[PDB]
PDB file of C-alpha atoms in Angstrom:
ATOM      1  CA  UNK A   1    -132.317 185.056 -14.726  1.00  0.00           C
ATOM      2  CA  UNK A   2    -129.308 187.423 -15.871  1.00  0.00           C
ATOM      3  CA  UNK A   3    -128.085 187.338 -19.178  1.00  0.00           C
ATOM      4  CA  UNK A   4    -124.436 185.480 -18.931  1.00  0.00           C
ATOM      5  CA  UNK A   5    -121.627 188.179 -19.695  1.00  0.00           C
ATOM      6  CA  UNK A   6    -118.611 187.123 -22.044  1.00  0.00           C
ATOM      7  CA  UNK A   7    -115.314 189.156 -23.264  1.00  0.00           C
ATOM      8  CA  UNK A   8    -115.545 189.603 -26.996  1.00  0.00           C
ATOM      9  CA  UNK A   9    -113.287 188.242 -29.413  1.00  0.00           C
ATOM     10  CA  UNK A  10    -110.846 191.092 -29.598  1.00  0.00           C
ATOM     11  CA  UNK A  11    -109.981 190.742 -25.706  1.00  0.00           C
ATOM     12  CA  UNK A  12    -108.982 187.308 -26.223  1.00  0.00           C
ATOM     13  CA  UNK A  13    -107.014 187.796 -29.061  1.00  0.00           C
ATOM     14  CA  UNK A  14    -103.217 187.132 -27.993  1.00  0.00           C
ATOM     15  CA  UNK A  15    -100.157 185.736 -29.515  1.00  0.00           C
ATOM     16  CA  UNK A  16     -99.771 181.702 -28.544  1.00  0.00           C
ATOM     17  CA  UNK A  17     -97.104 179.787 -27.657  1.00  0.00           C
ATOM     18  CA  UNK A  18     -97.210 177.435 -30.832  1.00  0.00           C
ATOM     19  CA  UNK A  19     -94.877 175.182 -29.889  1.00  0.00           C
ATOM     20  CA  UNK A  20     -95.594 171.239 -29.649  1.00  0.00           C
ATOM     21  CA  UNK A  21     -95.840 169.093 -26.201  1.00  0.00           C
ATOM     22  CA  UNK A  22     -92.587 167.516 -26.062  1.00  0.00           C
ATOM     23  CA  UNK A  23     -90.939 170.990 -26.859  1.00  0.00           C
ATOM     24  CA  UNK A  24     -92.630 172.350 -23.674  1.00  0.00           C
ATOM     25  CA  UNK A  25     -91.580 169.227 -21.603  1.00  0.00           C
ATOM     26  CA  UNK A  26     -87.800 169.542 -22.733  1.00  0.00           C
ATOM     27  CA  UNK A  27     -87.660 173.086 -21.102  1.00  0.00           C
ATOM     28  CA  UNK A  28     -90.216 172.493 -18.716  1.00  0.00           C
ATOM     29  CA  UNK A  29     -87.915 172.824 -15.370  1.00  0.00           C
ATOM     30  CA  UNK A  30     -86.182 176.222 -16.424  1.00  0.00           C
ATOM     31  CA  UNK A  31     -89.273 177.546 -17.470  1.00  0.00           C
ATOM     32  CA  UNK A  32     -90.943 176.992 -14.227  1.00  0.00           C
ATOM     33  CA  UNK A  33     -87.755 178.232 -12.574  1.00  0.00           C
ATOM     34  CA  UNK A  34     -87.180 181.551 -14.573  1.00  0.00           C
ATOM     35  CA  UNK A  35     -90.762 182.488 -15.029  1.00  0.00           C
ATOM     36  CA  UNK A  36     -92.486 181.518 -11.762  1.00  0.00           C
ATOM     37  CA  UNK A  37     -93.761 185.117 -10.512  1.00  0.00           C
ATOM     38  CA  UNK A  38     -96.000 185.745 -13.276  1.00  0.00           C
ATOM     39  CA  UNK A  39     -97.267 182.033 -13.498  1.00  0.00           C
ATOM     40  CA  UNK A  40     -97.792 182.217  -9.674  1.00  0.00           C
ATOM     41  CA  UNK A  41     -99.724 185.830  -9.762  1.00  0.00           C
ATOM     42  CA  UNK A  42    -101.849 184.041 -12.588  1.00  0.00           C
ATOM     43  CA  UNK A  43    -102.953 181.209 -10.566  1.00  0.00           C
ATOM     44  CA  UNK A  44    -103.182 182.705  -7.188  1.00  0.00           C
ATOM     45  CA  UNK A  45    -105.908 184.979  -9.386  1.00  0.00           C
ATOM     46  CA  UNK A  46    -107.612 182.048 -10.922  1.00  0.00           C
ATOM     47  CA  UNK A  47    -107.759 180.209  -7.461  1.00  0.00           C
ATOM     48  CA  UNK A  48    -108.968 183.295  -5.353  1.00  0.00           C
ATOM     49  CA  UNK A  49    -111.208 184.685  -8.212  1.00  0.00           C
ATOM     50  CA  UNK A  50    -113.076 181.185  -9.503  1.00  0.00           C
ATOM     51  CA  UNK A  51    -113.896 183.110 -12.881  1.00  0.00           C
ATOM     52  CA  UNK A  52    -111.878 182.981 -16.141  1.00  0.00           C
ATOM     53  CA  UNK A  53    -113.163 186.286 -17.444  1.00  0.00           C
ATOM     54  CA  UNK A  54    -111.715 187.938 -14.068  1.00  0.00           C
ATOM     55  CA  UNK A  55    -107.922 186.555 -14.979  1.00  0.00           C
ATOM     56  CA  UNK A  56    -107.572 187.669 -18.335  1.00  0.00           C
ATOM     57  CA  UNK A  57    -104.672 189.929 -17.986  1.00  0.00           C
TER      58      UNK A  57
ATOM     59  CA  UNK B   1     -74.933  66.684 -32.634  1.00  0.00           C
ATOM     60  CA  UNK B   2     -75.475  70.572 -32.975  1.00  0.00           C
ATOM     61  CA  UNK B   3     -78.129  72.187 -30.853  1.00  0.00           C
ATOM     62  CA  UNK B   4     -78.840  75.318 -28.973  1.00  0.00           C
ATOM     63  CA  UNK B   5     -76.916  75.071 -25.550  1.00  0.00           C
ATOM     64  CA  UNK B   6     -75.397  77.574 -23.495  1.00  0.00           C
ATOM     65  CA  UNK B   7     -71.524  77.540 -23.349  1.00  0.00           C
ATOM     66  CA  UNK B   8     -69.310  75.490 -20.514  1.00  0.00           C
ATOM     67  CA  UNK B   9     -68.987  78.465 -18.485  1.00  0.00           C
ATOM     68  CA  UNK B  10     -72.759  79.877 -18.854  1.00  0.00           C
ATOM     69  CA  UNK B  11     -73.871  83.278 -19.901  1.00  0.00           C
ATOM     70  CA  UNK B  12     -73.363  86.659 -18.073  1.00  0.00           C
ATOM     71  CA  UNK B  13     -74.553  88.148 -15.314  1.00  0.00           C
ATOM     72  CA  UNK B  14     -78.281  89.297 -15.468  1.00  0.00           C
ATOM     73  CA  UNK B  15     -79.921  91.789 -13.576  1.00  0.00           C
ATOM     74  CA  UNK B  16     -83.325  91.802 -11.547  1.00  0.00           C
ATOM     75  CA  UNK B  17     -83.550  94.152  -9.091  1.00  0.00           C
ATOM     76  CA  UNK B  18     -84.864  97.891  -8.750  1.00  0.00           C
ATOM     77  CA  UNK B  19     -82.416 100.670  -9.405  1.00  0.00           C
ATOM     78  CA  UNK B  20     -83.014 104.098  -7.930  1.00  0.00           C
ATOM     79  CA  UNK B  21     -79.880 106.577  -7.409  1.00  0.00           C
ATOM     80  CA  UNK B  22     -81.320 108.787  -5.329  1.00  0.00           C
ATOM     81  CA  UNK B  23     -79.963 111.617  -7.359  1.00  0.00           C
ATOM     82  CA  UNK B  24     -80.258 115.273  -5.950  1.00  0.00           C
ATOM     83  CA  UNK B  25     -79.660 117.876  -2.768  1.00  0.00           C
ATOM     84  CA  UNK B  26     -80.857 117.903   0.647  1.00  0.00           C
ATOM     85  CA  UNK B  27     -84.026 119.753   1.328  1.00  0.00           C
ATOM     86  CA  UNK B  28     -81.683 122.543   3.539  1.00  0.00           C
ATOM     87  CA  UNK B  29     -79.765 123.187   0.174  1.00  0.00           C
ATOM     88  CA  UNK B  30     -82.661 123.971  -2.080  1.00  0.00           C
ATOM     89  CA  UNK B  31     -84.925 125.926   0.737  1.00  0.00           C
ATOM     90  CA  UNK B  32     -81.446 127.923   1.112  1.00  0.00           C
ATOM     91  CA  UNK B  33     -81.134 128.542  -2.326  1.00  0.00           C
ATOM     92  CA  UNK B  34     -84.945 129.529  -2.723  1.00  0.00           C
ATOM     93  CA  UNK B  35     -84.070 132.168   0.369  1.00  0.00           C
ATOM     94  CA  UNK B  36     -81.332 133.563  -1.110  1.00  0.00           C
ATOM     95  CA  UNK B  37     -83.141 133.920  -4.578  1.00  0.00           C
ATOM     96  CA  UNK B  38     -85.765 135.686  -2.754  1.00  0.00           C
ATOM     97  CA  UNK B  39     -83.528 137.837  -0.993  1.00  0.00           C
ATOM     98  CA  UNK B  40     -81.736 139.196  -4.063  1.00  0.00           C
ATOM     99  CA  UNK B  41     -84.993 139.598  -5.805  1.00  0.00           C
ATOM    100  CA  UNK B  42     -86.183 142.120  -2.960  1.00  0.00           C
ATOM    101  CA  UNK B  43     -83.345 144.001  -2.783  1.00  0.00           C
ATOM    102  CA  UNK B  44     -82.985 144.583  -6.714  1.00  0.00           C
ATOM    103  CA  UNK B  45     -87.124 145.323  -6.777  1.00  0.00           C
ATOM    104  CA  UNK B  46     -86.378 147.905  -3.886  1.00  0.00           C
ATOM    105  CA  UNK B  47     -83.262 149.790  -5.389  1.00  0.00           C
ATOM    106  CA  UNK B  48     -85.558 150.112  -9.006  1.00  0.00           C
ATOM    107  CA  UNK B  49     -88.588 150.985  -7.601  1.00  0.00           C
ATOM    108  CA  UNK B  50     -87.135 153.943  -5.376  1.00  0.00           C
ATOM    109  CA  UNK B  51     -85.611 154.736  -8.508  1.00  0.00           C
ATOM    110  CA  UNK B  52     -88.579 154.843 -10.504  1.00  0.00           C
ATOM    111  CA  UNK B  53     -90.206 156.619  -7.584  1.00  0.00           C
ATOM    112  CA  UNK B  54     -87.797 159.466  -8.103  1.00  0.00           C
ATOM    113  CA  UNK B  55     -88.399 159.460 -12.108  1.00  0.00           C
ATOM    114  CA  UNK B  56     -92.338 160.028 -11.245  1.00  0.00           C
ATOM    115  CA  UNK B  57     -91.678 162.794  -8.975  1.00  0.00           C
ATOM    116  CA  UNK B  58     -89.564 164.382 -11.311  1.00  0.00           C
ATOM    117  CA  UNK B  59     -92.288 163.877 -14.346  1.00  0.00           C
ATOM    118  CA  UNK B  60     -94.654 165.292 -11.955  1.00  0.00           C
ATOM    119  CA  UNK B  61     -93.054 168.142 -11.013  1.00  0.00           C
ATOM    120  CA  UNK B  62     -92.505 168.612 -14.713  1.00  0.00           C
ATOM    121  CA  UNK B  63     -96.271 168.823 -15.156  1.00  0.00           C
ATOM    122  CA  UNK B  64     -96.246 171.626 -12.207  1.00  0.00           C
ATOM    123  CA  UNK B  65     -94.157 173.540 -14.275  1.00  0.00           C
ATOM    124  CA  UNK B  66     -96.103 173.389 -17.366  1.00  0.00           C
ATOM    125  CA  UNK B  67     -99.493 173.767 -15.903  1.00  0.00           C
ATOM    126  CA  UNK B  68    -100.302 177.613 -15.917  1.00  0.00           C
ATOM    127  CA  UNK B  69     -99.679 177.869 -19.430  1.00  0.00           C
ATOM    128  CA  UNK B  70    -102.081 175.092 -20.463  1.00  0.00           C
TER     129      UNK B  70
END
């Protein structure tokens, strides 16, 4: 069959949120309230595209 | 003479009958006590379980907020 297409290692490079799990849990609700629109857009794209390679941006 | 004899008036009383004092409460009292304990436990459990359900809902919505970054 066809060759599986995978994005290069430069495309995946991004500065990650390097905090612990308890740091995320302590500020979970304000993060959900304030940053709601890009997370909602990303997860709608994830549920509509069914492909992690098409939801990178 | 000197022998082992009872005194002139005899000895004291000596019991030979079964003695069971019948100590305790009636059945209505203990049954009512048990029913009251059951009702108090049920009320306390209803309050604590409702509070625990609210706490679980709060934790779940915290995970909902944290999901997209993960």
